[PDB]
């Protein structure tokens, strides 16, 4: 098994920032499978399963984190939506997420027990005051009937949670750290459900400096990918710092997070990529070319 | 023998606050044994987890030198096992056994357990399980809301009525056997402390087993457990906020533990409440 | 066997009011056991078993009535809650009722067949709850090896909603006399619209309605029954060598307050105990001759009981 | 032994049920053919015999339920009732098996007897068309066939009774659309075709399994009267036997019986509301009867419909 | 044969449906005309017993071309549907004498395609319409489409629109909303509609199918040791009455059961050799079936 | 390889309008195969599957088939509706149907293009998105290009609810807009390239009837040609067909049904008469009133 140190390190390669949330997941995950290999019992005491609750803005990395730690653990992974299952056959449907897990699991019961399950938009199922019924149906899953062995991760934006925390205690990232199970209670989640989610991870909103960092530093960074594309044409693609900043700015205005990044970049390079193979030594993308879209990239011969 | 005045006085030494609940327990208990000495009233404890429910029960049993036994509704013929468990601590003396006290925890959990209510009810009535006093504790997390709807949370509990319990999930015949109802508003620091270490699945025990897989011995100093309870009462989350407090104090330690060779680890309070110092590491 | 007349007379001693319902029960009961003694068959035709359905507000005497008529017939009695039957199929729960009957019956099959079974809160299972009606329905008919046929079944229920559906039907293509007068017009189909299945209602031919207890009734309940609250507390204060007296105005005040809460005779004890709590607490530490509870002490709770030395 | 001819089966139905001659003729044939098929086997000869489950259509309290119970009795065959509204969640298919185990219980756990058994589903019109429709399809798997007995629900006979309040109108509209004679429910229920059930809410594949359709005529005043005295377990006979244990002779003037019927028609409960009407009229009498010395008691219509007068008491001994 | 000639020959086998016969004539002619010179597939939409199957079988005879029938329901709900596909081809090859040439000229009729909209079958069945060579053969898909008439109405003139006319306004989009996949409909460019039932089809339904009503009742009467016979005129009278009610093949059983009800009732109480059902017994219901001792 | 310039030029010949969508496809396609040929340098290039968003009969399917032809690459179609239990066998079936037209060659198969129609239909079905998602990545289905077309009738409204003509609005489309529509995040992330199609103009419909290689007019003219007859469509007639096609809003789809109806009678009794040529006017099409004009070849008669 990989030490929490190792797991976090490999998470740093797929996700930028969120160091705290990653440290948490690393430990929660490590202890989880460490329990399975040794058995829930022993020694004279029954260890407790520790399902995870991911709390962060949309486009923060919640889903990616889940998919990633499943990959670096060569463990079968499956996604599900709390809203898609919110209304339906009812709870009978919830068992189907197991057959979807079994499918990617090759029908092997042992690997399936190792599997990880990510439930998205769990904050949506809580009543604003049918959705609550789902929490209880999905609650039966969390315990087991065996769904016990498998790890459950539940992500959500929790837009309102931010306010109730400020209210109870009377700085966005700071407030999230102060979150308590009772705060989720006032949000709409039932006590018996939250008790099944002991491990609570908070994800900070991406900074303008973060987006910039995401554009160039990751191994699969957008800039690196396009530079490699322009590289096949024998052309050298260069992004000015001011340009990267301009992209981030525009990405925050749309509040899509790191998601709207690629769409912004591809649009700024669309024209260039089109008539490139029919003509250069290198091409330079300035902020005037990105945010304004008025000027075409600089062409060097 | 002990007057209600005297009984409450002795209760004040074991639990703090809850003057009303204690006044009620004193009278209920006094009347119960007073009717036995001269030859059908029980108690229902409603309060948050860690409010002293269990302690109060255990206490009034001690100050009455009467055999005491606990039982959990979650584990409810195990019914007859509660009497033989009472008989064991009773030395198998039928007389002392009938004077015995029985505390049932988490009865609010069995209110949809409904088949348990009837089975547990036959006991309350009537070894003749008629003379023994029954005290049933429960959190009743939902009861606070139904009382409000019947038309803050502390004053509301005072207005609780058997009908409210009916809407909660308790059957009429069961509630009729629990005429006396006492409510609690505050948690007991000592209770929380007790919860952290004494239960079979106590937090401390769980983490000790976790650290055990690493071949490391985890030790909680008493001062530490008390610092955890204190903080838990400041947030008024009850026994719920306990785990979140403990995990946070052990988070760092759990992270870089599998990468070092330690004999044992000691969590002092300065590590918990202050969070300023890391646990002590012994090689 | 005691004539229906005699049965009703002995019910008058344990229950206050409800003269109509008691007349019904008396007849139903009398006919039931009269059938068992002569056999369901004969002569050339099969008599029909007549289980009862009690419909009345909470704390009106439904349970007491059942318990009582069991006593004055020296017949084994057992209680059960329809709610407990819902918590799956509970075929074992359903049959559990019989072994609990057998226990109080001394394991005697004959006495068990004579037994009476009261199911409380049946209105609660009206349309997992339905499944219970059907499972409980198998009981009513019959199958320890004991046959549940011979045994009488009484099913009580508040039926809060029933009052409205009867009005919706009996209305005229308002106002209705009263809740009690409306209950009298109750019909098997009205129970149908409430949530009870036809096959179940057909097994409950005898329908008895209970009117809300009067303030004068509540007062009567506080002092006249053998186990009256006032008598119980007077005996309690008696152990301390003190004489407890309730002024008539006080008993009235208790009733008044009990009707405001609409708990019926149920909320009586909680009211009385609250008024005497303080007094019971510091009583064993003082020397009094007697104590007097006035209406100012009960309804207002502002003044403490009068202490005589 | 030998099976009872349709003739014989109808004759014995006459003893327990008043009127409904046509319906009874139908059920008789449907039932006779059913068990004749089981004895001979579904296979052969050179052709596959078709199972013929029955669909009872009649107003509430018209004898649908009784008719089912009866033909079961006179065929010494295990019988079980079920309610369609109970099945209509997802554990309906499980409760389906519960109908079989409830049959098995009364069957003495014998697989052969169970296969002969009869199953009556009440209020099928209630589940008409999404959650209700699903049940039709879940109950439809039953009709065909598949602590477990592993028996095939095929062999057993299925009867499905329902009021079909709206069905009366849709049939009229089908006939009204073309050729827009007296409306008469009777000359309409007889005209009903499977497609009419379709427009009502029943799925095609379901109706196809209910090939035999027996309709029940609304009870006349005369029928009710006839029901109160002529059947073997008639109300009057039952009460007369009750009053007989007291050594008293109970008599119902014909005038009383009609007054009961009238009142029963006003409530439109059918034969159901009959017992309730009668017991209310004899309640007082039954109460103070055991405490007095009478020769006989006479119930007049003034005692029933008006309830103002108590029964006439004759003294003798 | 010219489309003129083809229609003329179709008139001799089926009555009415002049329009659908005109379309079929053109679709068929164009299909084989393109083959001779080296996807004009047909979709039949009509109530059950309108002649859909008869039409397909007929134009196959008048073109001396191998014909084969298939049921979409047999294929559905299985993974061996793709294999049963080749089974349709080998079934076509058998009646074709295993001559590849004649096989490619063959016609294939798929019945109850509206039933599968089953959607995994549309795809499986689609790969056939295209080609592997199942390209040259003509495909005709029949269906009742009971729900289709309603979606066309909703798709949206005074005095409303007759059902026989509403179907003439059918469009591929309407089929889409019905349940058929776009790629499947695109392979069935030719759509023919029928407004009238076929007396001859219904008659055919009463006696020829393996589970035919007449066969069923004959077996029932067989258990009594009685021989039940249906005179041709009787079967005809049943069909007629069935068309007046426009219930289709559905209203057949109800008609037959009524004509045999009395007889079935008092049959087990008498000793007969056989029983004959005439049209006077069916349509008029005035005379009881006829009893040979 | 063909430059995006060249690819777009050849698309112009088969598809009318959609200049923007075709510019996008050209780039996406070009970069895709350019990646396969080269596999570097020190960074991993990202596969760029395409998501076609446009009304029915706008050219989505045609575009896909076309760029497959002008790249001599195996092509296969599939419908997201047929994919809706798990249908793991259906999902992989798309591969064997691709292998069939691919001649069982693994290399050509990796080059293949796959078009999934009606993806908007399976929007939150979700299970299919995830099963189809495993495809997009690879298990190798990685090398092959995926194009997913959909009408997204509701998408137009949600975009307006956020951004607050139809074609101008589609240009403002964002991955989050698809999210609110019903598509799962992990699926949209696999569809980086988004192309929007404009509604076709009447001039376009007219252009589609006569100019494409498989144009309807050409197909029927070849049909009438086997009878030795010359079929001619008057400009006014082609215009009348387009008009009627726009009234039904079926797009280029309802074109054939319109044309076939106008030539039905004629095709029926044609093989039974001796004509030189046939002229279809706008009166015969939009009105359905007058039969086509029949011109008789010189006898022949004697």
Curated annotation (Swiss-Prot), chain A:
Free-text comment on the cofactor: Binds 1 Zn(2+) ion per subunit.
**Induction context:** By heat shock. Part of the clpP-clpX operon, clpX can be expressed individually from its own promoter.
Specify which residues bind ATP according to the UniProt entry for this protein. 57-64
Which domain of life does the UniProt lineage start with? Bacteria
> What protein name applies here?
ATP-dependent Clp protease ATP-binding subunit ClpX
| Similarity annotation | Belongs to the ClpX chaperone family.
Cofactors needed by this protein, per the record, are:
Zn(2+)
ATP-binding among keywords: yes
GO terms classed as biological process: cell division; protein denaturation; protein unfolding; proteolysis involved in protein catabolic process
Q: Report one GO cellular component.
A: cytosol
What is the stated purpose of this protein?
ATP-dependent specificity component of the Clp protease. Uses cycles of ATP binding and hydrolysis to unfold proteins and translocate them to the ClpP protease. It directs the protease to specific substrates both with and without the help of adapter proteins such as SspB. Participates in the final steps of RseA-sigma-E degradation, liberating sigma-E to induce the extracytoplasmic-stress response. It may bind to the lambda O substrate protein and present it to the ClpP protease in a form that can be recognized and readily hydrolyzed by ClpP.
Subunit structure of this chain's protein: Component of the ClpX-ClpP complex. Forms a hexameric ring that, in the presence of ATP, binds to fourteen ClpP subunits assembled into a disk-like structure with a central cavity, resembling the structure of eukaryotic proteasomes. Interacts with Mu phage DDE-recombinase A; this interaction remodels the viral transpososome for replication.
Q: Alphabetically list the UniProt keywords.
A: ATP-binding, Chaperone, Host-virus interaction, Metal-binding, Nucleotide-binding, Stress response, Zinc
Q: What organism does the record attribute this protein to?
A: Escherichia coli (strain K12)
């Amino acid at each position: 098994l990989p030490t929490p140190h190792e797991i976090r390190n490999h998470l740093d390669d797929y996700v930028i920032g969120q160091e705290q949330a990653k440290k948490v997941l690393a430990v929660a995950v490590y202890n989880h499978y460490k329990r399975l290999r040794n058995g829930d019992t022993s020694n004279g005491v029954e260890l407790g399963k520790s399902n995870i609750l991911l709390i962060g803005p949309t486009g923060s990395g919640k889903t990616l984190l889940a998919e990633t730690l499943a990959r670096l653990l060569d463990v079968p992974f499956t996604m599900a939506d709390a809203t898609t299952l919110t209304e339906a056959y009812v709870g009978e449907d919830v068992e189907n997420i197991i057959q979807k897990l079994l499918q990617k699991c090759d029908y092997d019961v042992q690997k399936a027990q190792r599997g990880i399950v990510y439930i998205d938009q769990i904050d949506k199922i809580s009543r604003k005051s049918s959705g609550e019924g789902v929490q209880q149906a999905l609650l039966k899953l969390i315990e087991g009937t065996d769904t016990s062995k498998i790890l459950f991760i539940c992500g959500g934006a929790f837009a309102g949670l931010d306010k109730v925390i400020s209210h109870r205690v009377e700085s966005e990232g700071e407030l999230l750290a102060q979150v308590e199970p009772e705060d989720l209670i006032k949000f709409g989640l039932i006590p018996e459900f939250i008790g099944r989610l002991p491990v609570v991870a908070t994800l900070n909103e991406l900074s303008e400096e973060a987006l910039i960092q995401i554009l160039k530093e990751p191994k699969n960074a957008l800039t690196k990918q396009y530079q490699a594309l322009f590289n096949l044409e024998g052309v050298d693609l260069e992004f000015r710092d001011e340009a990267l900043d301009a992209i981030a700015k525009k990405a925050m205005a749309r509040k899509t997070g790191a998601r709207g990044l690629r769409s912004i970049v591809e649009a700024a390079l669309l024209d260039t990529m089109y008539d490139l193979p029919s003509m250069d030594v290198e091409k330079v993308v300035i902020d005037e070319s990105v945010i304004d879209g008025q000027s075409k990239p600089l062409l060097i011969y």
